[PDB]
Structure formats: C-alpha cells, structure tokens
Amino acid sequence: AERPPEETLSLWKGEQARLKARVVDRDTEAWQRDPSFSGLQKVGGVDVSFVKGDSVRACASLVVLSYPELKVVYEDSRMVGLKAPYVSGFLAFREVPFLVELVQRLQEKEPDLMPQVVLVDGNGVLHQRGFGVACHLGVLTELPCIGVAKKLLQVDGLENNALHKEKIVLLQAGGDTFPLIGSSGTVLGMALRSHDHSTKPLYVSVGHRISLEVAVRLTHHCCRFRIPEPIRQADIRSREYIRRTA
Numbered sequence: 001a002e003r004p005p006e007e008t009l010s011l012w013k014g015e016q017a018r019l020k021a022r023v024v025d026r027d028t029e030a031w032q033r034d035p036s037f038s039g040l041q042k043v044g045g046v047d048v049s050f051v052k053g054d055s056v057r058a059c060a061s062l063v064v065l066s067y068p069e070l071k072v073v074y075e076d077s078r079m080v081g082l083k084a085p086y087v088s089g090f091l092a093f094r095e096v097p098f099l100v101e102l103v104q105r106l107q108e109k110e111p112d113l114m115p116q117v118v119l120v121d122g123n124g125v126l127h128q129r130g131f132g133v134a135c136h137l138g139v140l141t142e143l144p145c146i147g148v149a150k151k152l153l154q155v156d157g158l159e160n161n162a163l164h165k166e167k168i169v170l171l172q173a174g175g176d177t178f179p180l181i182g183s184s185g186t187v188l189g190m191a192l193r194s195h196d197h198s199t200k201p202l203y204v205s206v207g208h209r210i211s212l213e214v215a216v217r218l219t220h221h222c223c224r225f226r227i228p229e230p231i232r233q234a235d236i237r238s239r240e241y242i243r244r245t246a
C-alpha cells in the first residue's frame with residue numbers, strides 16, 4: 001500500500017539478520033563442480049508482475065526449464081494479494097511469501113520437476129544487509145539460488161559512477177565480467193555481459209548453496225537474450241496472465 005512504519009522496517013531488518021546465518025556461499029551440489037554442469041537437468045526462474053494502477057494485485061510465476069535445452073517443462077502463474085509496498089532492501093517481504101508457496105505447490109504437483117537451482121530476479125548477497133531476495137528465497141526453501149539484477153544496488157561503496165561505466169564499456173562479448181568490490185574489500189558480485197548483442201550488464205550475486213563463479217557461469221549459459229531464460233519466461237508468463245485478467 002503505502003510506506004511501512006519504522007516499527008515494521010525494524011522487524012524486517014531483524015529478520016534479515018536472523019536468516020542470514022543460514023546462507024551457504026559455496027558449492028554444495030555435484031553438478032556445480034562439473035566443468036560442463038553435467039548432472040544439471042532443471043533450472044528454475046521466478047518473477048512477480050504488477051498492474052499499473054493496482055497497488056494490491058500482482059501475478060507470481062515459477063517456471064522450470066530443461067537444461068541445457070532451456071525448454072519450459074513446468075509453469076505455475078498465480079494472482080496474489082500484496083501486503084507490503086516496495087521498499088529497497090526489503091524486496092523479499094513483498095514477494096518471497098508468494099514464491100515459497102509456488103515452490104510448495106510444485107512439490108505437491110510435480111515433485112520430480114523440482115529445480116536444482118533457481119534464478120531470482122533481484123540481488124542475493126549484494127544487498128544493504130548482505131541478505132537480498134535471492135538469499136531469502138534460498139534459505140526458506142533450501143534450494144540453491146542465484147541473484148540476477150538489472151540495475152546496480154549501491155551498497156558498501158558501490159556506485160554507478162563514471163568509473164563503473166568505463167568498465168561496462170570494456171565488457172566486449174557475452175561472458176565478460178568484472179567484479180563488484182565493496183569498500184570492505186569483499187567481492188559482492190559480478191557485472192556480466194550476458195549476450196553478444198547487448199551492452200547493459202547483469203549484476204549477478206550468490207543467493208544460497210552456490211559459489212559466485214559458478215553462479216556467473218550458469219547465468220551466462222542460460223542467456224538466449226539479455227535476461228536469463230528462466231527469469232525471462234517467468235516474466236513473460238506472469239505479465240501475459242495479468243493481461244488476460246485485464
């Protein structure tokens with residue numbers, strides 16, 4: 001609706017600190033250590049689309065794609081009732097309850113299509129408190145998650161200034177990257193040029209149960225276009241669903 005009170009934001013900050021202790025930022029799946037991701041068969045994607053004049057109605061979508069073919073083998077799109085407004089740094093408290101429900105519906109409907117990793121539209125550890133939406137989803141479902149954002153969250157000294165734009169120019173081909181280094185000296189994520197015919201990078205960060213280098217490489221392998229195909233197909237299908245109900 002409208003901006004939540006400081007009371008709520010405080011509880012939200014506190015919940016993010018509690019759950020962060022459960023993030024695993026290294027590889028835990030055998031396919032992640034494989035040079036060609038052998039053993040990876042199913043990649044998930046999630047998105048939530050909203051309506052222009054409607055602050056309460058949204059559409060949440062979960063897709064599972066075959067890998068490496070990137071063919072949609074499962075789709076579930078759902079109209080939902082929004083509770084929280086969008087506040088930067090608290091994106092999870094607006095969308096993640098609906099995404100968790102989608103995962104549980106998949107487990108009940110098609111348990112053999114449970115994805116081995118989820119691409120999440122939004123950051124993971126690249127976040128004001130080191131616990132973005134992709135970490136939040138990963139910890140609540142225990143699935144490996146990757147954060148993929150289209151704009152750079154300005155945290156820990158990260159800035160979309162002239163130097164940052166110089167480096168983006170230096171990205172020349174799909175798969176090129178440069179690291180996002182915080183003022184503490186830690187690597188929060190990578191800027192990734194996802195396709196040869198696109199210049200605007202993706203900003204990839206660890207969600208849960210994956211390393212950054214594997215996350216970046218897998219993100220690149222899913223990009224038929226600029227947006228990785230799992231996120232792209234959830235975006236397309238959730239928006240089409242809004243359109244038919246409007």
Ligand SMILES: [Ca+2]
Nearest residue numbers: 047048121122
């Ligand atoms: Ca989204």
Ligand SMILES: [Ca+2]
Nearest residue numbers: 047048121235
């Ligand atoms: Ca979207």
